[PDB]
Amino acid sequence: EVGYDDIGGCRKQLAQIKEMVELPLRHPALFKAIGVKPPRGILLYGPPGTGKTLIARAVANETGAFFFLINGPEIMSKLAGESESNLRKAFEEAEKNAPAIIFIDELDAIAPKREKTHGEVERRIVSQLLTLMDGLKQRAHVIVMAATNRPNSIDPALRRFGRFDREVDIGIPDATGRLEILQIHTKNMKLADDVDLEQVANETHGHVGADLAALCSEAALQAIRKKMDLIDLEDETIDAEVMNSLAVTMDDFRWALSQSNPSALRETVVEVPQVTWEDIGGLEDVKRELQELVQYPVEHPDKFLKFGMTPSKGVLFYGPPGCGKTLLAKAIANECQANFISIKGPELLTMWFGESEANVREIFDKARQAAPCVLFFDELDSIAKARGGNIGDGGGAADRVINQILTEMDGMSTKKNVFIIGATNRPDIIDPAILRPGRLDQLIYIPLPDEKSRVAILKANLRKSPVAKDVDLEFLAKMTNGFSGADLTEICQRACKLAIRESIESEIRRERQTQTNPSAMEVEEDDPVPEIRRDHFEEAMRFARRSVSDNDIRKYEMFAQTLQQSRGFGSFRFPS
Amino acid sequence: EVGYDDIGGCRKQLAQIKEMVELPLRHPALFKAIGVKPPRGILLYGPPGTGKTLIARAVANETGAFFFLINGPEIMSKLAGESESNLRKAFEEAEKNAPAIIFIDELDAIAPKREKTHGEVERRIVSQLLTLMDGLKQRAHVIVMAATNRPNSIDPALRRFGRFDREVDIGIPDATGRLEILQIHTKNMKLADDVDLEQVANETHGHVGADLAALCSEAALQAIRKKMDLIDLEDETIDAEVMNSLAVTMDDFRWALSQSNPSALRETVVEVPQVTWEDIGGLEDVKRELQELVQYPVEHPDKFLKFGMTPSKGVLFYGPGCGKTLLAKAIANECQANFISIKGPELLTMWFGESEANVREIFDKARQAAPCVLFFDELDSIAKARGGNIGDGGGAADRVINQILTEMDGMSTKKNVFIIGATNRPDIIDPAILRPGRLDQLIYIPLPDEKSRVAILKANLRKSPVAKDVDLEFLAKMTNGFSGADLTEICQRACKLAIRESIESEIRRERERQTNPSAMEVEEDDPVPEIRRDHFEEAMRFARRSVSDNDIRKYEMFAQTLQQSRGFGSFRFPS
Ligand SMILES: Cc1cc(OCc2nnc(SC3CCCC3)n2-c2cccnc2)ccc1-c1ccc(S(C)(=O)=O)cc1
Numbered sequence A: 001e002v003g004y005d006d007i008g009g010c011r012k013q014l015a016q017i018k019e020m021v022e023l024p025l026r027h028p029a030l031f032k033a034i035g036v037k038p039p040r041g042i043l044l045y046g047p048p049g050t051g052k053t054l055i056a057r058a059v060a061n062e063t064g065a066f067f068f069l070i071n072g073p074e075i076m077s078k079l080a081g082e083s084e085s086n087l088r089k090a091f092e093e094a095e096k097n098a099p100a101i102i103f104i105d106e107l108d109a110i111a112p113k114r115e116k117t118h119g120e121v122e123r124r125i126v127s128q129l130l131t132l133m134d135g136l137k138q139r140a141h142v143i144v145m146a147a148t149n150r151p152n153s154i155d156p157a158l159r160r161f162g163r164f165d166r167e168v169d170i171g172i173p174d175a176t177g178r179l180e181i182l183q184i185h186t187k188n189m190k191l192a193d194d195v196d197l198e199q200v201a202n203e204t205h206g207h208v209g210a211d212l213a214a215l216c217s218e219a220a221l222q223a224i225r226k227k228m229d230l231i232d233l234e235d236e237t238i239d240a241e242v243m244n245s246l247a248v249t250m251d252d253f254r255w256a257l258s259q260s261n262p263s264a265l266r267e268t269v270v271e272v273p274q275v276t277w278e279d280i281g282g283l284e285d286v287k288r289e290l291q292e293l294v295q296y297p298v299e300h301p302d303k304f305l306k307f308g309m310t311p312s313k314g315v316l317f318y319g320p321p322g323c324g325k326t327l328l329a330k331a332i333a334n335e336c337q338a339n340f341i342s343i344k345g346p347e348l349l350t351m352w353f354g355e356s357e358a359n360v361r362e363i364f365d366k367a368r369q370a371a372p373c374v375l376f377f378d379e380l381d382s383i384a385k386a387r388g389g390n391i392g393d394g395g396g397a398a399d400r401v402i403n404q405i406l407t408e409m410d411g412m413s414t415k416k417n418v419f420i421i422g423a424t425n426r427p428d429i430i431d432p433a434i435l436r437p438g439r440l441d442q443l444i445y446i447p448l449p450d451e452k453s454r455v456a457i458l459k460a461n462l463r464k465s466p467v468a469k470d471v472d473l474e475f476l477a478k479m480t481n482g483f484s485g486a487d488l489t490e491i492c493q494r495a496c497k498l499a500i501r502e503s504i505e506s507e508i509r510r511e512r513q514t515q516t517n518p519s520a521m522e523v524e525e526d527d528p529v530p531e532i533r534r535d536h537f538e539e540a541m542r543f544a545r546r547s548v549s550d551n552d553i554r555k556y557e558m559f560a561q562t563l564q565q566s567r568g569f570g571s572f573r574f575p576s
Numbered sequence B: 001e002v003g004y005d006d007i008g009g010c011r012k013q014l015a016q017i018k019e020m021v022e023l024p025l026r027h028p029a030l031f032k033a034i035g036v037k038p039p040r041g042i043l044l045y046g047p048p049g050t051g052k053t054l055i056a057r058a059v060a061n062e063t064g065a066f067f068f069l070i071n072g073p074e075i076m077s078k079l080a081g082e083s084e085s086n087l088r089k090a091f092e093e094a095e096k097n098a099p100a101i102i103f104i105d106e107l108d109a110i111a112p113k114r115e116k117t118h119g120e121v122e123r124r125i126v127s128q129l130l131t132l133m134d135g136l137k138q139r140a141h142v143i144v145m146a147a148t149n150r151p152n153s154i155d156p157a158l159r160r161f162g163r164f165d166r167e168v169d170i171g172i173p174d175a176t177g178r179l180e181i182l183q184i185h186t187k188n189m190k191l192a193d194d195v196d197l198e199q200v201a202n203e204t205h206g207h208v209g210a211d212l213a214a215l216c217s218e219a220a221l222q223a224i225r226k227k228m229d230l231i232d233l234e235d236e237t238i239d240a241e242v243m244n245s246l247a248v249t250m251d252d253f254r255w256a257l258s259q260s261n262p263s264a265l266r267e268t269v270v271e272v273p274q275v276t277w278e279d280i281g282g283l284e285d286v287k288r289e290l291q292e293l294v295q296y297p298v299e300h301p302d303k304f305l306k307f308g309m310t311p312s313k314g315v316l317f318y319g320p321g322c323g324k325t326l327l328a329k330a331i332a333n334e335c336q337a338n339f340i341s342i343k344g345p346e347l348l349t350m351w352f353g354e355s356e357a358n359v360r361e362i363f364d365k366a367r368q369a370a371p372c373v374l375f376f377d378e379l380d381s382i383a384k385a386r387g388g389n390i391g392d393g394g395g396a397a398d399r400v401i402n403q404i405l406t407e408m409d410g411m412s413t414k415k416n417v418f419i420i421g422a423t424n425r426p427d428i429i430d431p432a433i434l435r436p437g438r439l440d441q442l443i444y445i446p447l448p449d450e451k452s453r454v455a456i457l458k459a460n461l462r463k464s465p466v467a468k469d470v471d472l473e474f475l476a477k478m479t480n481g482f483s484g485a486d487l488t489e490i491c492q493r494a495c496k497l498a499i500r501e502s503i504e505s506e507i508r509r510e511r512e513r514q515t516n517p518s519a520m521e522v523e524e525d526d527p528v529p530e531i532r533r534d535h536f537e538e539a540m541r542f543a544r545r546s547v548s549d550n551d552i553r554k555y556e557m558f559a560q561t562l563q564q565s566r567g568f569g570s571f572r573f574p575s
């Protein structure tokens, strides 16, 4: 049957559910001699196709509890006045086979009322379901798990104490989980040796477990269409050996990925960033300060408690564009192995234009659920720029979105895990309230990368590309007196583009030469340009440009010295 | 059974309910010979999981009244046309066992109609319930108590005279009540000696009684998972001695608190502030004036009545991080009155959302929790949002301030709510706020003095281990014009430096054993056990004055802009 092996994604909420349900189910007799209330209901919510029903079935099988599935529309499709009988009989039958697990798939259909509550019979169904759910006499060990797309879609009374008192957001699987899902979905098709499922997994961003299964099936169907159809040898049952002779090639998977259309790309991603400190070449003072502020409270919470100091839970990065603030935030999140949530400027601008700031509440709740997390508000000054910056609106710096963010931060800190990081290229226009204590008070300045930092940035950008050892990278980094990280990335991309164009043009001509003059003996000399050379980099650097002018760096230096530690205490000595 | 001991939180509305219900129930025969109308219905409302049903059951048990529970959805889940029979039979049965208490849990389901009133059968249920509730012939002593999340959620006709004429807001338990709830929920698990339930209670802000019970259960489950599972010795019934051998450690409670997710952190807090005058080192003139304005009318109301003077019920603090919020908390604490704080973000939210009816709700909540000190922190936020130098084309009037003025004008009836306003920009504050009957008593909070600075440093460093070598008076005197916030920043930076040094040092020392395993283990304890002079010197190296002298000059201008003339200083009566 289905078990933990079938449950893919390694998303680490299956472990939480296990810890939740073993003792109530794995050790049911224990609770008989101990006075404790187990989890009467667990609300699994997330994007559709994430395997919530699969997870519930696997838990039921691995714990031995009698699994009962109450399909939402199955009862809803039944005639009014007798569907209530179906729900009551389902609970009674689950009660009989104690311990039992009752799974309500698509719970947002039985009790969708969000206090709007249209209709008459559906109100009866929701109220009777409430009576049954609250009617659990704590006898036996029936655990009621329900599936819902979002927590707010179901009736709020279902979310109350004793009905569904604890919720788990399965969420979209990540690259590691996408790879494991691909492995589980590719185990009987005799996958080819060339295909590794790693490149596909990385390119598979935005898919869900159902999406991964559909992509694998589409690749298999492409393989079946490409071969074994030309022969057209078919019978009632295709020969096992004949079908096994085919191997799903990388090309088939690539085409399937091109024909994927993932079912929820837009959904926000809660993922441990893969970026590491290696990608950023320097910022040692900044790196150490970030390590302090974030890592120290958790690695050594006892020492923070000993001195009675509450660590700051907000940091605001300020600096010129393209210097690596987003990368620095990702790296700091990676070092602590905490989930990273990034709120770019377009999202804030959308909330501001639409006059919908309640999304800030939802974003903060999501960050709270995925703890430990690093809630990063990238380019937080976007709203101020949108309203102006030199003259702007007649009013002050306060705006709806920033006010909601401040309210959530003030109401935050309770969680002890969410850490707010803010990045802004225009510190002058940022609202001052953002910098007050209890908010993003720790201001960190990210300067233009140094020569060593520039070398590291070039190496990180060119790690994947084949770069000839002849081209000296230290010389190029030193040559770039004030290039930003974005400028270095542009130079590397232009060099790669030049190399790609030259290689394409050359092999194309070489193919004409064989077509025009068919050689008697075929002897390919391989690639005329196998790796990026000095001339490519020289031509690319010919177009190198400094995006960040020295005047805006001067303004940042002004603000930095606008956070000046006075000029009279530098020699402070105690009287002794 | 359940009684007052089970009812935790010490939130002091259980006492009010007791005073409400003893004589109607504890002395039912008394009302037979005396012509008086007892409380026919009591509406208990508050956040879910606050123990309203528990409170009703405890009152019923402790008074001997026959408790009847009419679950909201229990009747609502029944078939239309026969649920009305269930409600009528419930009232008749409660009538038979006089005296009896009928508890309607989740009343917002039987009669949710807020004049929207969707559907047909639910209108019948609400009207029939109204007929029954108003149909109490004052015979027998059935008391109908109902539970609801908010007063406005239920049908307004239920709120009318004779149906539910008096309401009690149980509200979220406070630190003292959170601690007592933890004690009641931790009494049979054999709590460990290291765990005290005091630190957990302080860190437990935002939880409700149900949340506290869930946290305790989660800690117990963590303890059960950590131990007794490794051995894996299990049978049909776990041995009592084996299970008793385990003790819930502080670490388990800490993890549970980390995994709490309290079910209503956002809900407004009505709590007696723990801040005391000790935290503020000075402001003796301000302290005495605040004591006068707030405490004197209540401590000696008779003397206020004798002279026919109505004490001012509004005070506006103006000043540069100087402790206005702390001063308001201290004044509330001295009078032992509930404190409600409305920070600027809330006002800005009401202004941006064009929802000023929340001011009415806030004032009603303050009125219910009397005696209370309704503090409007940073009241000038809306004016700043609209500008301040040029601003909008219109005047200083805005929607939120206008609603606040309307509520204040309609206030004073309660005789208990006291409005305190704090503003860092007195120039832009609306003048109507300062008219008589409003926050007229303007109090200026200046930058802390040397003695005040010493007190602020001591308060900030009370918890942290500070070596006696570091002289605090010298540091306070050295800081010529540091604000309270600046002193707090200096103390926090010193603590951060000490923490980093201690962490780095013990980390190296651990390498030292790992690299060179010593033959005899002899830990020398902590290399930095308390904050020293060098830490404070390095921290003060980064000390900064947040408040410039020009803004202090503007505050001095406004202060002398409330100048008591210049010709009456020598006023003498003719004699
Ligand atoms: C001991 C303590 C821990 C804490 O939390 C620690 C923590 N855990 N997970 C996280 S989050 C995750 C980590 C990486 C990404 C984010 N954190 C955390 C906390 C603050 C800043 N960054 C992380 C808070 C406050 C305290 C205390 C300090 C003084 C006193 S007294 C009365 O003066 O003696 C009482 C209590």
Ligand SMILES: Cc1cc(OCc2nnc(SC3CCCC3)n2-c2cccnc2)ccc1-c1ccc(S(C)(=O)=O)cc1
Residues within 6 Å of the ligand: B293, B294, B295, B297, B298, B301, B302, B304, B305, B306, B307, B308, B309, B310, B311, B312, B313, B335, B337, B371, B372, B373, B415, B416, B417, B418
């Ligand atoms: C006697 C009186 C008491 C009063 O109320 C007293 C009071 N009780 N609780 C509170 S509130 C709580 C206390 C700490 C936090 C808040 N207060 C109160 C009142 C005003 C200001 N602060 C507190 C009002 C007005 C009067 C009177 C004055 C003159 C006349 S005559 C016709 O000229 O002879 C008639 C009536």
Ligand SMILES: Nc1ncnc2c1ncn2[C@@H]1O[C@H](COP(=O)(O)OP(=O)(O)O)[C@@H](O)[C@H]1O
Residues within 6 Å of the ligand: A006, A007, A008, A009, A047, A048, A049, A050, A051, A052, A053, A054, A055, A105, A147, A181, A184, A185, A208, A209, A210, A213
């Ligand atoms: N991590 C996974 N491992 C194996 N199958 C998965 C996984 N995630 C999703 N699926 C696929 O998703 C299909 C249906 O999705 P389902 O489990 O019902 O979730 P939901 O009810 O939210 O749509 C299943 O048949 C299963 O094959």
Ligand SMILES: Nc1ncnc2c1ncn2[C@@H]1O[C@H](COP(=O)(O)OP(=O)(O)O)[C@@H](O)[C@H]1O
Residues within 6 Å of the ligand: A161, B006, B007, B008, B009, B047, B048, B049, B050, B051, B052, B053, B054, B055, B105, B147, B181, B184, B185, B208, B209, B210, B213
């Ligand atoms: N102060 C308290 N003392 C003991 N238990 C409490 C307390 N507050 C809440 N609870 C717990 O809350 C549980 C259910 O909450 P309840 O009393 O029904 O309030 P509500 O109906 O508003 O949700 C109870 O089983 C009880 O254990």
